[PDB]
Enzyme design. Structure first.
Site, PDB file in Angstrom:
ATOM      1  N   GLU A 123       0.626  -1.512   0.402  1.00 26.63           N
ATOM      2  CA  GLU A 123      -0.168  -0.318  -0.378  1.00 26.63           C
ATOM      3  C   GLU A 123       1.054   1.078   0.425  1.00 26.63           C
ATOM      4  O   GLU A 123       0.477   2.376  -0.607  1.00 26.63           O
ATOM      5  CB  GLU A 123      -1.190   0.105   0.831  1.00 26.63           C
ATOM      6  CG  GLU A 123      -2.175  -1.105   1.299  1.00 26.63           C
ATOM      7  CD  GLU A 123      -2.779  -1.193   2.336  1.00 26.63           C
ATOM      8  OE1 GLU A 123      -2.418  -0.700   3.687  1.00 26.63           O
ATOM      9  OE2 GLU A 123      -4.082  -1.779   1.809  1.00 26.63           O
ATOM     10  N   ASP A 131     -13.982  -3.515   0.588  1.00 29.62           N
ATOM     11  CA  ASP A 131     -14.817  -5.360   0.737  1.00 29.62           C
ATOM     12  C   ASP A 131     -16.046  -4.204   1.101  1.00 29.62           C
ATOM     13  O   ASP A 131     -15.467  -3.775   2.471  1.00 29.62           O
ATOM     14  CB  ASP A 131     -14.587  -6.023   1.337  1.00 29.62           C
ATOM     15  CG  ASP A 131     -13.579  -5.788   3.040  1.00 29.62           C
ATOM     16  OD1 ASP A 131     -14.260  -5.721   4.166  1.00 29.62           O
ATOM     17  OD2 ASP A 131     -12.390  -5.306   2.838  1.00 29.62           O
TER      18      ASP A 131
END
Ligand SMILES: Nc1ncnc2c1ncn2[C@@H]1O[C@H](CSCC[C@H](N)C(=O)O)[C@@H](O)[C@H]1O
Ligand SMILES: Nc1ncnc2c1ncn2[C@@H]1O[C@H](CSCC[C@H](N)C(=O)O)[C@@H](O)[C@H]1O
EC number: 3.2.2.16
Lengths: 245, 246
Positions: free
Chosen positions: B17, B204
């Site tokens: 990330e 998600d």
């Protein structure tokens, strides 16, 4: 090797540190050596062959309750190790116990190994990391001499126990449940410092009392038993090297 | 005398990330161990225009090499970075789950308004509020006006999944976003009095029909690029401004 010369206690609640502070004539640090504007408390002293330090996460700004839980315990373990380079850490505090595992109110346990019950990451590799299984430093002579009980400790940031928590705690076969131990071990492991635990049972997790009520009821008396053991632990350690315990 | 922001720290839990952001700004990995020796922590530093930029990650774990996720490692690096690096502002950038009922969609990069924990239950008065640890992110109205990022409450906990007890508290705290470090970065930043803002990119839907671990892993790469995209625009917006201008 060389005799142990410096011990740091990591203690979450200040009233649990205080009797030990007074017993060994320790003084509250004034120069904020772990960082400025922090609520943390450090007590320092030299006693026979041991430099002795006791660090607490301190009183919360809003109300002044102890800053309990894994994060503050992890912060003070890290900072005090970096500042003081102790030979050994002892995480002393109160915990819940299992009656079926031999735990009784007021027992002060040694810890064999330590886990988290509340870092659930259902992906391979991450799952084991979450659990974070770590062994306490081996102290067989201390255990024998002081005649102390021993068991696995399971750590999480909640005082109560959800269904999921309990399933994981039973599965890991813990005798003891606390709120900081495994975070202390993670930091100590990261910085290669031996860690010993002293965990004193205020409440029976498999028992017929609500946890918060039983913990609060027995806190004062069990703190005194914890001080009695921690004192003996300190005296035992004095003048020994790590091999001797 | 007050001055435009000169120094930013990014706290990012996963190395993958952090890398797109590292590459974008040509940051290099520090060799001088500014946070302490013998640690797996990774720090990247550079200078983009008027801003020194630090990106810190908790590092890959010793056993298998996975990111050292969760509140404890994040809170350690926040702590160590503040003390060594003395930043004007911290940005906690990462991935998160989102509640579609709360307007979250996969790939959305949110700006957090405030932050709580859903997994520090201490059913004692005073201790209860302490455990929850409700904290406000630093106020950035102009950034929001410029960038047009969705906003909402973040709820933090050390588990990727959600137990029934977690859910009850998440629902009642009316969080839009769920993550694994946010509230602990806020705790540490509060203690040391450093402004903190949060960029949380939805991988998600916690109230969707896909298993969490599965959906998270499936979307991680594309959502990470989205997160880089927003963080880049944040860095460029902050440049030359003071705190009170955002
Ligand atoms: N049942 C229980 N679960 C978790 N921590 C407990 C406990 N009883 C006592 N404690 C300890 O005492 C207080 C917390 O710091 C915690 O570590
Ligand atoms: N459903 C979810 N719950 C908690 N954290 C999540 C998540 N989806 C993504 N994340 C974040 O991404 C990674 C973890 O460190 C966590 O912070």
């Amino acid at each position: 090797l060389r005799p142990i010369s410096s011990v740091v206690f990591v203690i979450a609640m200040q009233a649990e540190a205080l009797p030990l502070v007074n017993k060994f004539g320790l003084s509250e640090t004034t120069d904020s050596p772990l960082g400025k504007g922090l609520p943390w408390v450090l007590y320092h002293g030299v006693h026979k062959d041991l430099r002795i330090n006791v660090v607490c996460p301190g009183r919360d700004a809003a109300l002044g309750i102890d800053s309990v839980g894994t994060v503050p315990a992890s912060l003070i373990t890290f900072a005090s190790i970096q500042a003081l380079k102790p030979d050994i850490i002892i995480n002393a505090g109160t915990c819940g116990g299992f009656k079926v595992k031999g735990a009784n109110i007021g027992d002060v346990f040694l810890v064999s190994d330590v886990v988290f019950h509340d870092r659930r990451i259902p992906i391979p590799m991450f799952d084991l990391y979450g659990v974070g299984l770590r062994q306490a430093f081996s102290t067989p002579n201390l255990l024998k001499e002081l005649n102390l009980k021993i068991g696995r400790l399971s750590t999480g940031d909640s005082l109560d126990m959800s269904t999921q928590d309990e399933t994981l705690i039973i599965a890991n076969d813990a005798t003891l449940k606390d709120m900081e131990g495994a975070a202390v071990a993670y930091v100590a492991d990261l910085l290669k410092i031996p860690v010993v635990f002293l965990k004193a049972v205020t409440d029976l997790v498999d028992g017929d009392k609500p946890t918060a009520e039983e913990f609060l009821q027995n806190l004062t008396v069990v703190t005194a038993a914890l001080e009695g053991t921690a004192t003996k632990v300190i005296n035992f350690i004095n003048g020994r090297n790590l091999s001797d315990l």
